[PDB]
């Protein structure tokens with residue numbers, strides 16, 4: 370049904386201590402859990418990392434090469450298995466607590482990072498996770514700078530996932546992100562990535578979904594925005610509690626998207642990863658709540 374369909378793999382961005390230490394503060398996704406999701410039919414994994422850990426001096430400085438290697442190990446595990454890996458600096462438009470306002474340093478950051486993966490045609494690049502509370506022109510230029518840096522590295526074959534303001538929410542998209550339609554790419558492989566949760570405030574922090582139909586309701590206008598501006602999109606992060614109302618909401622959002630695959634290239638569940646424990650949305654096999662409680666709904670699209 371969709372071009373791409375799978376899961377986020379979180380953990381490398383975990384914890385409050387920055388840089389912090391592996392095994393205590395954060396961890397990398399587990400290739401064998403990723404293999405199990407691939408065996409279920411998922412062809413897409415969006416792998417979270419923290420910029421401050423990849424780059425402990427400055428945005429344009431030296432890598433922590435052990436952290437980079439680890440990120441690369443997960444990417445090779447995804448791509449070796451034939452799936453696309455979407456590389457997600459999980460940073461909210463910010464670096465070291467401050468809004469990234471230097472388009473130039475951002476462009477440089479993305480040219481270096483894309484340089485690491487330019488030859489892996491199964492890799493995809495997400496410009497940044499959930500920009501918010503920042504100037505809308507800056508968000509536009511930040512995304513263009515990423516595109517420009519990526520292609521300047523010679524990463525010319527890979528799709529580039531761009532995110533908007535208001536936490537790239539689908540439900541607020543037309544209200545704030547209209548200028549994002551002006552992004553250009555010499556290769557023409559821009560995907561508009563939006564997120565959508567189904568609890569009352571859209572924060573994705575409660576199991577309760579507002580209603581059976583709230584998912585469809587929250588992506589309708591964005592769907593129409595994509596059509597009217599002749600772009601394609603993707604739901605990079607979405608979830609609902611393992612309960613009957615949420616199951617219908619999730620089910621119904623995916624069904625509506627499946628009726629509009631001219632614009633929706635697919636979706637990724639928030640989230641899998643080895644340290645979610647009893648997280649309400651965990652899709653980590655063998656016993657994540659979403660893994661046992663929701664996966665059947667997602668398999669209709671696999």
Ligand SMILES: OC[C@H]1O[C@@H](O[C@H]2[C@H](O)[C@@H](O)[C@H](O[C@H]3[C@H](O)[C@@H](O)[C@H](O[C@H]4[C@H](O)[C@@H](O)[C@H](O)O[C@@H]4CO)O[C@@H]3CO)O[C@@H]2CO)[C@H](O)[C@@H](O)[C@@H]1O
Pocket residue numbers: 379382383384385393394395459498499564572573574606639644645646648
């Ligand atoms: O650090 C070691 C310690 O970690 C505990 O695991 C914690 C993590 O420390 C913490 O980083 C992690 O934070 C999650 C948070 O719970 C989610 O609500 C949030 O999900 C957001 C997401 O970040 C947005 O971008 C997305 O789109 O919206 C979602 C939905 O709100 O994601 C962050 C991860 O980025 O939470 C873990 C708690 O479960 C371990 O439990 C502990 O044992 C370890 O010692």
Ligand SMILES: *[C@@H]1O[C@H](CO)[C@@H](O)[C@H](O)[C@H]1NC(C)=O
Pocket residue numbers: 391392433435436439
């Ligand atoms: C990289 O992974 C290894 C485990 O394979 C670990 O010992 C190391 O601490 C990891 N991350 C970093 C930043 O070193």
